[PDB]
Symmetry: C3
Subunit: 238 residues, 3 copies
């Protein structure tokens, strides 16, 4: 199970990267069009932040597509993995932004936002180090390290942010829940796919893995953005 080798370079997964690229682009320009006439300062903020997400992902996918965003990591055993490191560059900026959308919806103080971005960033960076490690001891230690950070992220999301958002209007609290839940389930799928993909146990192929990440990314990007930018929760408050 793989796909189609779009660049004649022996990488069938490029078919999924290509589709991923296309999807992130139309998602970016759909959001720009849809929010082009928005004058509401609170709403343009959600639009601004949310447009940048698929925008940067577009760049990351195009880079993985061309092959520029992928590198060959030789394991201690001599086994060579193709690590699409560009994903981490993507996530370093996108996850904090998505987190920022949730923070705004909850109306939590700046310290809560700083904490989330800080821990989230630590999660992605450690995830990248583990991805480029040569030893299994190191590779899985980093996975566990990043996972812990992810735990704190989910924790403050389901407590601090949740309680704050529960004090807001029914419209706002409604949308918050139907994004945090989306995040909780979608985001958790990344560490899993990672440990079962070529970066870990390797029961999943690079072709299927890429397809999976592409479905995860588009949903967590465009899907999340669609639900958010569509809600009345981004328009001031009642």
């Amino acid at each position: 199970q793989a796909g189609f080798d779009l660049l004649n370079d022996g990488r069938p997964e490029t078919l999924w990267l290509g589709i991923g690229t296309l999807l992130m682009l139309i998602g970016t320009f759909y959001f720009i069009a849809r929010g082009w006439g928005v004058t509401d300062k609170e709403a343009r903020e959600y639009y601004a932040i949310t447009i940048l997400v698929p925008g940067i992902a577009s760049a990351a996918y195009l880079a993985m597509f061309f092959g520029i965003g992928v590198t060959e990591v030789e394991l201690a055993s001599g086994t060579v993995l193709d690590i699409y490191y560009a994903r981490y560059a993507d996530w370093l900026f996108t996850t904090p932004l998505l987190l920022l959308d949730l923070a705004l919806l909850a109306k939590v103080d700046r310290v809560t936002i700083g904490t989330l971005i800080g821990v989230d960033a630590l999660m992605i960076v450690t995830g990248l180090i583990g991805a480029l490690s040569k030893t299994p001891l190191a590779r899985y230690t980093w996975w566990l390290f990043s996972t812990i950070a992810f735990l704190f992220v989910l924790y403050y999301l389901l407590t601090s942010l949740r309680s704050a958002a529960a004090k807001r209007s029914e419209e706002v609290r409604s949308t918050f829940n139907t994004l945090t839940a989306l995040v909780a389930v979608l985001w958790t799928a990344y560490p899993i796919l990672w440990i079962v993909g070529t970066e870990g146990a390797g029961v999943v192929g690079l072709g299927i893995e890429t397809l999976a990440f592409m479905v995860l990314d588009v949903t967590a990007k465009v899907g999340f953005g669609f639900v958010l930018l569509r809600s009345r929760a981004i328009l001031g408050e009642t």
Copy 2:
């Protein structure tokens, strides 16, 4: 047409990098001296931001000077280009700062500033990826990708920022215009020099190109800063 090989390493363009370095340094310490006694909070802000620009550029130029900020990228055809990647590292921080000076002058909200910095950053990063690409398809696709971002940058500069600045005093609006125009013409010269230089069609030599970028940088840095830090527009308002 080239210059002088200052480090005996076979790089005559170092003569232009060296001059570029020297110029960015005296520019940084001239601004520090000139603004050393400024107590006005609004003015120190312009000084602070504006001093950091030639300061970081200094580091970038010195790095390109020594050869540390340059790498050999082998094209698919086997053609080897000398990519001074350090420029992009420079721009990632300097362009947003310059943009920040214009944002402050216009007195636009934080969302407008975030948008500009976000898109600008996407412009520089994609520009760097294109610079390090091995395929012509990839190299020019990234150029076009970065150009689009540049378009949005110029667009919001000439509309959102312009309209805001037009509501301010004649002194402030005056200086804004004579910086935005400077930016519009100078900044546009970068994508051009890029597509005609060694990173593209290659009708321009690496020696001339370096000289050009050095003249562009010093003007967009020191020149911009001189006009700004000299105006009364940075001192509160009438």
Copy 3:
């Protein structure tokens, strides 16, 4: 003089990196526990910022421990140095955060904070370039370059921040002084160890150097944090 080669990879300094790692971790989770029940918004801010410091250092040390955070730089003379570049990645984020703790304590405006972070960052980056340089001319020129930035950092710390903090309560002013002094002496030890270690004259071994940096880091991290998070100065004001 060295230590113990914990990973059987011929690096006895890993014994110091390992201890450094362990210490940064218990420091991170001690601070989290100690501040877990803090409701004071001003205090959680100090806790938040201060927890992130040993947290990121933990990641950096673990990376140097595994060997992922170290690279072999070949000097022009053919001499090969083992540069633990991860330290710089660590510092790029930690120093600004520590600086941020001092800024908050002083209650200085955002421009002062931006300036400190900007110059500090320039210090670390140039320090890294010098660390990876191949020529002695370049390596020491960067050291001097970074040192100048450090000078400005210390300067504004002992003037702008000091004078501001001197206007606050005796409790706050007291803690500020017993952190700025700690910083002034500890921080100055880095450029020294650098110029006398393998990155410079090399009178100090890589084993001793690593031990030294580990003692410096833990004190500037956990020690600084202990004194700060223990004081009443982080709780509003009298």
